[PDB]
């Protein structure tokens, strides 16, 4: 397969960084793309073979090398805000079918000031008694708010087991301050169970949000906890009421 790292990254303007891409399919061809809203996938650099490298459409500000067949590093010597994007590495056998194999992507946010990075606050709202009486169902809502960048993963756990049944999370977070490019975000999710299940006090419901933020090496001079990668959670227990 194709493996790129890191999956998420926050950089302060000027910092250097290398996005890694490795494939174990003996593919001779490797390439890097950046994907931006409505901008589609744009080729940055490509390598038709080990030792060979060529620039793409938006090579500006990026450096690549291909000393080996398995690796194709994309380096940002001095990260700029404009380089905030989702990066994809793709490979394929030289000729053959031409089938491209993509990595999972690397979400990078470059900021002038890291003070704009905030972890999510997470809260769980318990089922409405009116919903229970009207439908015999009970919907819990998890709300994650005030985070930036939008590098999060929300999941529900019932009695320690991750659940997918009866759940749905907003496809995309919403901006709390619409006009701002670095607006903080909010994301909601719902978990619906039968009223009887919610009415059992032994049932434990947990909503957790993994937030990808700063590394425990970045300089932080704020009177608040450094917004490092972390999990923020909220929980509730069923109630006979």
């Amino acid at each position: 397969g194709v493996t790129q790292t890191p999956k998420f990254q926050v950089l302060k303007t000027g910092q250097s960084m290398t996005l890694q891409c490795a494939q174990d399919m003996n593919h001779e061809y490797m390439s890097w793309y950046r994907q931006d809203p409505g901008m589609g996938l744009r080729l940055i650099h490509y390598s038709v073979g080990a030792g060979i490298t060529d620039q793409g459409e938006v090579p500006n500000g990026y450096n690549v090398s291909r000393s080996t067949t398995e690796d194709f590093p994309l380096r940002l010597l001095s990260a700029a805000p404009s380089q905030t994007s989702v990066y994809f590495c793709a490979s394929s056998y030289v000729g053959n079918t031409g089938e491209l194999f993509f990595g999972e992507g690397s979400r990078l946010t470059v900021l002038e000031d890291l003070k704009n990075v905030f972890p999510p606050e997470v809260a769980v709202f318990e089922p409405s008694e009116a919903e229970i009486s009207h439908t015999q169902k009970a919907t819990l809502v998890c709300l994650a708010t005030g985070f930036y960048p939008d590098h999060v993963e929300l999941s529900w756990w019932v009695n320690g087991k991750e659940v997918h049944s009866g759940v749905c999370t907003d496809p995309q977070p919403l901006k709390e301050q619409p006009a701002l490019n670095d607006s903080r975000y909010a994301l909601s999710s719902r978990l619906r169970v039968s009223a009887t299940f919610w009415q059992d006090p032994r049932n434990h419901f947990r909503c957790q949000v993994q937030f990808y933020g700063l590394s425990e090496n970045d300089e932080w001079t704020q009177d608040r906890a450094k917004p490092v990668t972390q999990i923020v959670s909220a929980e509730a227990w069923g109630r006979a009421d």
Partner: protein, 203 residues
Amino acid sequence: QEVTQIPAALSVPEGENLVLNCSFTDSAIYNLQWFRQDPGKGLTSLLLIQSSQREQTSGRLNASLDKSSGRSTLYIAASQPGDSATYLCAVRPTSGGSYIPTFGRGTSLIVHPYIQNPDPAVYQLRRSKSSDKSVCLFTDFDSQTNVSQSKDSDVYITDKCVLDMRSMDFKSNSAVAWSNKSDFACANAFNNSIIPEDTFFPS
């Protein structure tokens, strides 16, 4: 040289067969590949059509290719809510063409669930442990119902999503609205969109 995908966005009720188009200005291509991309995830390959092929299939998916006209069509039979995603089309050059692929901007597809028994209602959900926010849930509405944005500064309304209670073979739509624990009951948040006159608004 240029890849165009239309419609840019497609909304349809589940069960309907779907048609997605991909066009390219340069007929000299080595192959065409269709991908699926879920929000915040990577690209999953769906079908690959070589220049020497005219059709490729995989389950409910089947794509055709007409190099001369610079066209490829992806057909999705009896669409399902799970088919919702962005579909991307890409073509690669032939005869020493830098091997450089060209990607279209994609088609965003939403397949809406059929709600057998609509039961539109707005419910207020309390506490986060108290002293936090005011949250409301608009739920069980038919898929034709659209949720718009509020005209208030301290009010937020999410997009709608469908959840499936497997055991009961029951699906339901919902949207969440909230404000800041104060002078504004969230049930009032949705009064900016078109909703059933019989929507249930319990206190």
